[PDB]
Design a protein around this ligand. Structure first.
Ligand SMILES: Nc1ncnc2c1ncn2[C@@H]1O[C@H](COP(=O)(O)OP(=O)(O)OP(=O)(O)O)[C@@H](O)[C@H]1O
Ligand SMILES: Nc1ncnc2c1ncn2[C@@H]1O[C@H](COP(=O)(O)OP(=O)(O)OP(=O)(O)O)[C@@H](O)[C@H]1O
Ligand SMILES: N[C@@H](CCCCNC(=O)OC[C@@H]1[C@@H]2CCC#CCC[C@@H]21)C(=O)O
Ligand SMILES: N[C@@H](CCCCNC(=O)OC[C@@H]1[C@@H]2CCC#CCC[C@@H]21)C(=O)O
Ligand SMILES: [K+]
Ligand SMILES: [K+]
Ligand SMILES: [K+]
Ligand SMILES: [K+]
Ligand SMILES: [K+]
Ligand SMILES: [K+]
Ligand SMILES: [Mg+2]
Ligand SMILES: [Mg+2]
Ligand SMILES: [Mg+2]
Ligand SMILES: [Mg+2]
Ligand SMILES: [Mg+2]
Ligand SMILES: [Mg+2]
Lengths: 264, 264
C-alpha cells in the first residue's frame, strides 16, 4: 500500500545518492528496507576491508597538505575560548548563537579571533608575508536545516603583509577549489562582523565567506597591515562532493559513518 | 645581580630543552633574554621555511596511519555530548571535572562512551573482530600541574570480539609505542569507571590507562562481547618525545607553537 511518514523517514536514512530506488513504487516497505539494509552493510564492509579513513579526517588531511605545500603554517588553537573574544569581534548582544561554557568561556563560533592573535604575534618573528591556516571544530546554535550543523568543521586560511589583494585572494580560492574538483562563482555579500564579503557559491550553497582587509575591527586586535582571509565549512564541501541531501550525512555523528547509516 | 621571579619566569618561557644556558650564572637578564629571543626567532623561521606542520596535527596524522594500516576504522564523533552519558558511564556526582554546556550537554571528558556506541552499532554490520579508534579533543577541569591540561587530545583504540585478551592488548601497546620510539612499563592500577587498569608508564608519567573487558558497565551500553581498549594523551606523548618541562608546551595554545614561545 502506502508508506507512513515514519516508514519513508527510515528509508531515507538508509538511501544513498548512488542508489536508484523509488520509495513510492508500490513495493512494500519490508522489501525496500531489506534491500537498502543489504546495500549499506555491503558498503560499510567494503570501507572496513579497503579504506578505513573517515571522510572528515581525510578531507582535513588533504586540505592540510595543500596549504602546507603552498607556504602556510598549520595552526591548532583552542576550541574553548574566552567569552570576551565575542564582544571584541563586534558581535553585539548574531550573538544568540553562542554556546556558553561556565560563565566566562564559550565554544568558538569561528576561527578568526585566534588566527588574528597568531598573525599579530608571528609578524614579530617571521618574514613578510605571514601565511597561516587552521582546520577544526566550531559551534553555533542553529535552526534545523539541510545546510547547518551546530557542531561543524571550519577551514580558515589567511595572509598578512604583501600580496593581500582581491586578485590574489580569488586566485588562492580558485586553486583550492580546482584541487577539490568543485565548481563555484563569487558573489558580493555583507556580514555584521567583517563588512563586505566575497561569498564563494556552489549554486545556492555558500561554501565560504572571504574578506579583503583592512577593516576597522583590525585596531581592536592589533592588526595594522593589509590582510586577506577566507573561511570554508568542510561538511558543506563534503555535501557537494558526495551529493548528500542533508549535511548531517557529513557531520561528526554516531548516526552516520562516511554518509552510511549506522542503524543497521 | 640577581633575577626576580618575573625575570626567571620570562626566561623559562623562552628556554627550550635543547638549550644549554644557565639562568643564574650572573649574566644580566637583558643579555639572556636577547640571546634566547634570537634563538627562538631562528627556530620559528626554520619551521616556517622548511616544515610548517603543527606537532599535534602531525602526531594525530602519524597515529591515524598506524591504526588504519593495522585494520582499525577511523572514527570522528561529537565533542559536545549529552550530560546523560556522564551518569551512565558510572561517574557518580570525579564528576566535578566536567565542563557543562547549556543545561543538558557537556564537553566530553573521554572518548569511551561514543566508541562504545560505535562498537555496538558496527557489530551488526561488520565481521569479527570490530576494531576502531578515535583521536580528538577532550575536556576536564584540573588543578594547575605540569602534566594536566583542561583541553587535551585523546587517542582511544579498542577491539570487540575475538582476540580481546590481555596479551593482545599489551602487544598492540608495545607495537604502538615502539613505533613512536617511547620506552615504557605496565603497572596495575584501578579507576572508578572501569575497575582494574593496566597503566602504561614512562617513569612516573602515566601515558595511558588500558582495560580488558568485560566489565559490569557493559550492560548499560549494550556491550555483550569481550573487548579491550586503551586511552592515551597526545600532549603527554609529545612531552616525552620533546623533553618538555611542562605539558603546556604541547597544548593547543596561542602562547606556544611547536614548543616555541609566540611572545617574541
Ligand atoms: N552552522 C553551520 N554549519 C555548517 N557549516 C557552517 C555553519 N556556519 C558556517 N558554516 C560554514 O562556515 C563558513 C564561514 O562562516 P560564515 O560566518 O561566513 O557563515 P554564515 O555566513 O553564517 O553562513 P550561512 O549564511 O549559511 O549561515 C560558511 O561559508 C559555511 O561554509
Ligand atoms: N587533564 C589531562 N591533560 C592531559 N592529558 C590527560 C588528562 N587527563 C587524562 N589525560 C591522558 O588521557 C589518558 C587516559 O585518561 P585517564 O582517564 O586514564 O586519565 P587519568 O587516569 O585521570 O590520568 P591522571 O591520573 O594523570 O589524571 C591518560 O593516561 C593521560 O595520558
Ligand atoms: N569566519 C569568517 C571568515 C573570514 C576570515 C577573516 N578572518 C581571518 O581570516 O583571520 C584574521 C583577520 C583579521 C584580524 C582583525 C580582526 C578580526 C577578525 C580576524 C580577521 C566569517 O566570514 O564569518
Ligand atoms: N578513557 C578511558 C580509556 C580506557 C578505554 C576503555 N573504553 C573503550 O576503549 O571503548 C569502549 C569500551 C566499553 C563499552 C562498555 C562501556 C563503557 C565505556 C566504554 C568501554 C579511561 O581509562 O579513563
Ligand atoms: K538516491
Ligand atoms: K555533531
Ligand atoms: K560521521
Ligand atoms: K634547557
Ligand atoms: K588549550
Ligand atoms: K600550540
Ligand atoms: Mg549563519
Ligand atoms: Mg551567509
Ligand atoms: Mg558567510
Ligand atoms: Mg585525572
Ligand atoms: Mg591515573
Ligand atoms: Mg588513567
Amino acid at each position: 500500500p502506502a508508506l507512513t511518514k515514519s516508514q519513508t523517514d527510515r528509508l531515507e536514512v538508509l538511501l544513498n545518492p548512488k542508489d536508484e530506488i523509488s520509495l513510492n513504487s508500490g513495493k512494500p516497505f519490508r522489501e525496500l528496507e531489506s534491500e537498502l539494509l543489504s546495500r549499506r552493510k555491503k558498503d560499510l564492509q567494503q570501507i572496513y576491508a579497503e579504506e578505513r579513513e573517515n571522510y572528515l579526517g581525510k578531507l582535513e588531511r588533504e586540505i592540510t597538505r595543500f596549504f602546507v605545500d603552498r607556504g602556510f603554517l598549520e595552526i591548532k588553537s583552542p576550541i574553548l575560548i574566552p567569552l570576551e573574544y565575542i564582544e571584541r569581534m563586534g558581535i553585539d548582544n548574531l550573538s544568540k548563537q553562542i554556546f556558553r561554557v561556565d560563565k566566562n568561556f564559550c565554544l568558538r563560533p569561528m576561527l578568526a579571533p585566534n588566527l588574528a592573535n597568531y598573525l599579530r604575534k608571528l609578524d614579530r618573528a617571521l618574514p613578510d608575508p605571514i601565511k597561516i591556516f587552521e582546520i577544526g571544530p566550531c559551534y553555533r546554535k542553529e535552526s534545523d536545516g539541510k545546510e547547518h550543523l551546530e557542531e561543524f568543521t571550519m577551514l580558515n586560511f589567511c595572509q598578512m603583509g604583501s600580496g593581500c589583494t582581491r586578485e590574489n585572494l580569488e586566485s588562492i580560492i580558485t586553486d583550492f577549489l580546482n584541487h577539490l574538483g568543485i565548481d563555484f562563482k563569487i558573489v558580493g555579500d555583507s556580514c555584521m562582523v567583517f563588512g563586505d564579503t566575497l561569498d564563494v557559491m556552489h549554486g545556492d550553497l555558500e561554501l565560504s565567506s572571504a574578506v579583503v582587509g583592512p577593516i576597522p575591527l583590525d585596531r581592536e586586535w592589533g592588526i595594522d597591515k593589509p590582510w586577506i582571509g577566507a573561511g570554508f565549512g568542510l561538511e558543506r564541501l563534503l555535501k557537494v562532493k558526495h551529493d548528500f541531501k542533508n549535511i548531517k550525512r557529513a557531520a561528526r555523528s554516531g548516526s552516520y559513518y562516511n554518509g552510511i547509516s549506522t542503524n543497521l
